[model samples]
Target: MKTEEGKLVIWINGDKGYNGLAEVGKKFEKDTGIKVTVEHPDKLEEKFPQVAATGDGPDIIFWAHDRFGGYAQSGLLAEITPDKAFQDKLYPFTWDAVRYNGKLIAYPIAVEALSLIYNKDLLPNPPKTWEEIPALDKELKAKGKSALMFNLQEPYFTWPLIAADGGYAFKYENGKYDIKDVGVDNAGAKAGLTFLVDLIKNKHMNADTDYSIAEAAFNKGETAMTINGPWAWSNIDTSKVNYGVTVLPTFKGQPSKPFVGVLSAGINAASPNKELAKEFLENYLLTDEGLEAVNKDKPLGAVALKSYEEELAKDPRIAATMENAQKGEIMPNIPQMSAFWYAVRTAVINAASGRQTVDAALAAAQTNAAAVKVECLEAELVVTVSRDLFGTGKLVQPGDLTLGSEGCQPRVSVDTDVVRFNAQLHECSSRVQMTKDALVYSTFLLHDRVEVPIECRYPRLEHHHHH
Candidate 1:
């Protein structure tokens, strides 16, 4: 393929950063003599797939990384694994977000996560933990001011509270995900939500707090601190409010774990310019200049590149945001996550607004999410483990064990291998592996249920279970 050959089409979201990307594309055209056309589409998520299916889509797509999994699973995205040098340039978690089933689907461009935006005038030093917020709020309230505020009605803002206390949307282990193992309404979630309710009841905060209200209050200097992302900086009147950004404080002694999001660029699998697309991404866009242009175009978020982080950190707010992001977890990219958002949002809003008890609200959210349909991948796995089926008696041979059939796909074995299954089982199973000196009493890989006792399998030597 010629470097100075053809016109490369790149479709980007019109929301923000298009101008910056357009400028970068012009730079690319100057260097490679490849005419680059950048277009802004209103609904790239819904349109990209439709256009790519007909082989008429743009050569590259720049958008959020969370949807890469769905697009990749549908064979709409081309895989491009960056070399170790390029991989070393990014944060480990940011790189992980771009991979689906161990295949790199997109090139990460920017990173964003929640941080505590505080008014420096009100509180000179930000609180280290959330427990300090109440006293500050009381003090401020007595002086005709509010202590803290956030979009209590939105799960995006409220999720940190749940995560800080140990709640998670799915069980992730060893680079694999188990969507059936949801911890939305668990004990940690309840504690977090209940704390929010108490704040509202005590008049420190109100249930009517939404993004607009929280932001307005902070911008106008009516509130001291709020939980928000760097995107809010665009709307804030820095002249009116002396604000400082910092990592979110711990809750109940546990660090607040916000959902880290990355903006990424992906190549359309059906596009005829796949080679050209890869060249641009791996050679040009992943460079320091390329990433710098991205933030220049839209100075709302941080980038995944470690080199640029030092420069971005020159601004205290950006530094604090990056620090918080480094301590946070990436949001799930699976299709099941769609069902989680609205359900959790409703539960959070209801609990905060006093419509339902915290326990009831969370339970309701879990139930509603469980009812929603999940788009499962064909290559996904569900592994089951059985404990002590042989009654600690003499170890039986592998042939003595019999696997039962429950779900649609019944793939079971007594050997030391991680089993991969479909998602129809409705049971959440993690990766199954027997370590050294750990004897497998009985291995029954059932889809839905387990009953009869199976014989134990002892290798009588060091064994390694590989996936």
Candidate 2:
């Protein structure tokens, strides 16, 4: 048990570090007599494991439950089975995510889902099925308006297309999933892809536009609607654009149930205060206080549970969105889910770029999804550094080589190993000339450099420059 003086430390993932978590922490502390300390990892994926491995992380770690399946599979979560009574009171969606192989691993919190958001002024009534959108899009485009604005590059949004086709990534039947057969290239998927292509081909929409571009177009009221999710909710200006949201448009008399992302809390398996953390999640989430706090910022319709709908209806935007989310499909928290994205991306890109027939692309994607395996791989992040000044302290030589200039020039190589890592720093004579007042360091200085590894597994002094 924690004392009143003791600060219960919690780590959260938020837009600005732990701003949202911190605000909720204040409310949690007021309701419960526990002093809470909220923190945010610089990079949650990289830092979570590193911090947890050192056994110095916060007592409570907050993250999106969907993307962190690896942590649970690796036994990073504390077994909350003992607190099953407390967990039982929470939302079913949150509880559904915490259990794996009969063990309760995490505590549940909020739920997020994708919705079909449209401009009320442009689209008086949203389309009921996926087939209706195409014809409506043509009418809207002929009138100098865009029917839909979506980013084809992201799999999160495009997954709905497959969902509407009555296709799934991995299905669990009789307890075990038939992971080998991915239906990304099925007839439904091809139909979904064809739908996307027609939108672009008919000049009704453009796939090049990302979320930002789509929202901007919607704000201008040029686009009737967009196939987007919750994150875009905060960006919509109600005063400027009379807009509302629903689930993704469906196809083939089917309802498009999107991949539901659940945000939850869980105790650390390594923590000594596991019981305390579990108790906190119990009181915070299962109770009305925690649920209300989670929904406070969520202006749209999606609620965590069916029970919250009546209260959710009070807010008009939330009510419209909830109409879609109430029937939304929750995504599986399986580790091998990466393959589904890979498969969907391949099919989507092929159709969007007009590279292959939608049928052919979908078939290839289905095969690829079946072969996907979960494995850990090193990620290469590119951090750009500006080269306004050289590393070495030398005479400032500003070379002016422009149009209508004289042939006279100074060829000097300014190189320094001050910041450059270990490798070979050899300057060629042809590429440089040494002067009394000037110095030649290295030729690699003319290009952009990166921190690359000649080898993997262990950290070493490695950086390569890019021209």
Candidate 3:
């Protein structure tokens, strides 16, 4: 097994990262006398697990951090312990993105999130709030131009509104995701949908306004502004449009909070050159020279590192995206997040098409998302208990409780010595205790035994066929 050929190979999913890494590789070669090669695979995400499993994949993979769990779980990614000094230099969110189950699985390179990408020629001033957009819409229409536009059918674009209005995909707490707590149907989500629904109904936008249409509309001067990210810049002929970027407008007096996604590099566990991969990513890529090369290649969403953020901000697009990244929510990296996109997209599209009421559509979205079955077994118990017996207050402590599964169906297990306690009292009735050893048990032995039906089952897989 010839693991080291005096060269390190890296796989990147996007052109920007590839180009940036190649440039940095040149400097790395000159400095360390070790050659570096970067490859851009069109189907990197789909082929990665198999490729890495063969023990022939690149030493490092560069892409969004969302899929890190799948790779790490498959034992294809090496757990990395970055130097505390280097880790301290990273943004808190970026540091979190590279971690899986509290272990660093990747090297974060950049932060990306959507913002208000507008045409400066259309209006000299940017709208500060959603309320001001209507007047601008009318004024633009009078001049045969549309005010604002975005991929109406895409949940990624629509999520900012929902999030800014207080909606969330999952309840995140203590470095964990509660998939049961979906917020798409919550009041904040419904309030956010109102803005989208009104945009479609009154602003004359249609459900057919997809990414291409929105991009073309903005680039062709048909629309004054578009809510997009740095990725949109490449498609637009900036010279012709004179575009400007700013944070998304406020919704109900609060800034629209987009999902801040980080592009990161993960080492292949099978790679023999793990040490070299770490050095290149941490020592080389984190340097000013490496970041500058990347920023130049695709000023779009490249990390605005503290060393160069002041200079990078000179470009309005990077500056605005950076600002939004600070206020935005870090997108969840859990596998359950895969179901969120489809659910939110359907809800947004249905609401835009008037197929369902905003509230109803969003509620349906939440319901469907919560119903989504994962390839893991989850058992939940609802019990009525007494406050006095359970020592009062919400004593729901989830400690080391993990539900396992076999295949995508009904199966369960718990590690020995792992105990998790959840007790809730309603009218001072009874309590439910969930211990891995006992699985899930409801015993009302003390004052009264509240009879709770114990049923631990798998959700129907047919429902998730569409996903």
Candidate 4:
């Protein structure tokens, strides 16, 4: 087998996370002498797609699982299957987070989901069930502390209760999600909403339970318990609050599940150094020693491997999060997931606040979801592949160019002048760059083996009269 020698580049959002990979890159250079670049841009999520459109993106990306589905569908990411030895060792939903249409497109690195956190000074014994909350509140309010509080209007903090009775934003079927089959309008959903309304009406929970308010109240020891994720613990720990983390209280004997999010590593399909990237991931990123290094400075979040059981037990909240993360649904990486959040958030606000009936609020989500627009415009994008105005460049044939993967229909013609391809392009949002006066397109015009940088500004929008 011929080993391809090239530089491997990786992109992530943090020094705490990607810095571990950077040190590992040094080891790879010692063994293979291939340079590795680890980058963490301020606008990583936005910048990645903009660069990807220009046929220039890193070979590896450490992003959330949410971006994997959209990138894979757009042909920006490559599919990969892990060795059974590696795959068999992880938590069940670790693979689920990176799965796109039945194929694996990314590798799961860490996991997090919301759970109940109780300050031991206020409530030494946490309630085991939602029914127990009302009775506990009687004892709590005597000392003027609420039993439980969360940002009720926010779907993320309230998801466990709202989705407790089998409600879901989208119906997942046979390894893929059907975005059109919204289940929020069902009877099970109404039961969840009805329960919330009852709690707030009775003052067992706060009506104005905004995120900041909840955080402040919990941090000051004014509230007995709050529903929050691993991100909130640093402040609580700093406040010297003795707290214990636990799963959400069961509702009506059924477990309340929160949405689980995972940090993932996705490989780019456009990079010529993909094989080199794979070798680095296998050798440096997934091992027990590698996992220890990444989390040593601070936790990446929670471990996905059972082999890292001791590592998970290192943090109080991390140990609790892994159990709940596996218990909850992996947040869908599908494109339509954007439509679900705002719609459910609106329903939660209306129904829980008594502004509208539970059934009416849930049903309105269908209309609210239509707000996510797919405004694809028709336009012509022309690129001339030449090094100079005199047209001195390499010849490009029809098979040498690819625009279809990006939803561009085109005609290619090559001559002594240079290679030119024109297309009636779709408005792939990531490919577009907004400017003060005009829009710029950073699109892929792959020549021969890889990238050929071709950028054009502000397409003509005025349409001519058709006779």
Q: What digit string (tens of lDDT, one per residue) describes model 1 on residues 288-351?
A: 7876776665564777777777667688878888788777788888865756675687677667
Model 3 misplacement above 4 A: 1-9, 15-17, 28-37, 41-58, 234-240, 300-305, 310-316, 354-357, 373-467
Q: What clash pairs does model 2 have?
A: 116-246, 130-250, 185-362, 300-318, 301-318, 301-322, 415-441, 448-466, 449-465
Candidate 2 regions exceeding 4 Å error are 1-20, 28-64, 81-85, 142-144, 237-240, 271-276, 299-302, 305-310, 313-328, 355-360, 373-467
Model 1 whole-model lDDT (C-alpha atoms): 0.69
Candidate 2 weakest ten by summed lDDT: 449-458
Best by lDDT: 4
Error of 4 at 390 (Å): 57
Error of 3 at 398 (Å): 28
On residues 354-464, what C-alpha lDDT tens digit does candidate 4 reach at each position? 756777777756433422221123465655443222122334455655553455656766676455666654542226556445555544444343332233444234224
Compared with the true structure, model 1 gives a TM-score of: 0.69
The reply for model 4, stretches above 4 Å from the true place, is: 1-59, 81-93, 134-144, 151-154, 173-176, 197-213, 270-276, 297-302, 310-319, 322-327, 349-357, 367-467
Residue 453: error of model 4 in Å? 40
* Stretch of 10 with least lDDT, candidate 4: 368-377
* lDDT digits (tens) for residues 1-467 of candidate 2: 21112457777665322444455667767876666776666556446655666565667776666645656776677776544455444466567675676666666665566678888888889887777766887788788897788766678777776667667777677876666555565677667668778877876667577666777788778889887655566557543678877556667777776777666676766677666566666655445555556454533234454455445657555555555566666666665565566557656765776755677666656544553222222232111111222223332222311111133122333333112122222211122224333332211112222111111121222223320
Q: Give lDDT tens digits, candidate 3, residues 294-366.
A: 7666653747355655456577677788789777888887765655665687678667877668876776565
In terms of lDDT, model 3 sits at 0.68
What TM-score would each prediction reach against the true structure? 0.69, 0.69, 0.71, 0.65
Q: What's the lDDT for residue 32 in model 3?
A: 87
> Sort by lDDT, best first: what order?
4, 1, 3, 2
What lDDT does the true structure give each of the candidates?
A: 0.69, 0.57, 0.68, 0.70
Per candidate, the number of residue pairs that clash is 1, 9, 6, 0
TM-score of 4: 0.65
